[PDB]
């Protein structure tokens, strides 16, 4: 049903939406981005980012906002809206997710 996860890198396994899959947790997320491969190809999806070039004034790429749920075996982790563009965004949680899941110093 659910997987250990060995050491602070991007794989482990839990269960999203509805059902178990596996996925990679962030030990350093600010906002959560899911890439487009991970979204419901049902409707398109488009956000408005910014992209400061300090000198070059300019604007993030348009990411979905289709949040996503996901949920440990014991019934709990973490959802919330995301950033979802087709470049893939390095595919993040957030630091609400993550401090959950396993980040928050809990000792």
């Given at each position: 049903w659910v997987q250990?996860?060995?050491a602070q890198k991007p794989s482990l396994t839990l269960w999203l939406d509805d059902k178990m899959f596996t996925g990679l947790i962030?030990?350093?997320?600010?906002?959560?981005?899911?890439?487009?491969?991970?979204w419901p190809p049902n409707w398109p999806i488009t956000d408005t980012?910014?992209?400061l070039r300090g000198?070059?004034?300019?604007?993030?790429?348009?990411?979905?906002?289709?949040?996503?749920?996901?949920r440990d075996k014991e019934n709990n982790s973490g959802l919330?809206?995301?950033?979802?563009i087709?470049?893939?965004?390095?595919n993040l949680w957030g630091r609400d997710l993550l401090s959950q899941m396993k980040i928050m110093m809990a000792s």
């Open positions: 250990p996860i060995t962030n030990t350093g997320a600010d906002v959560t981005i899911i890439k487009l491969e991970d980012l910014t992209n000198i070059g004034q300019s604007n993030n790429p348009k990411q979905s906002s289709k949040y996503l749920t996901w919330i809206k995301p950033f979802v087709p470049n893939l965004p390095v």
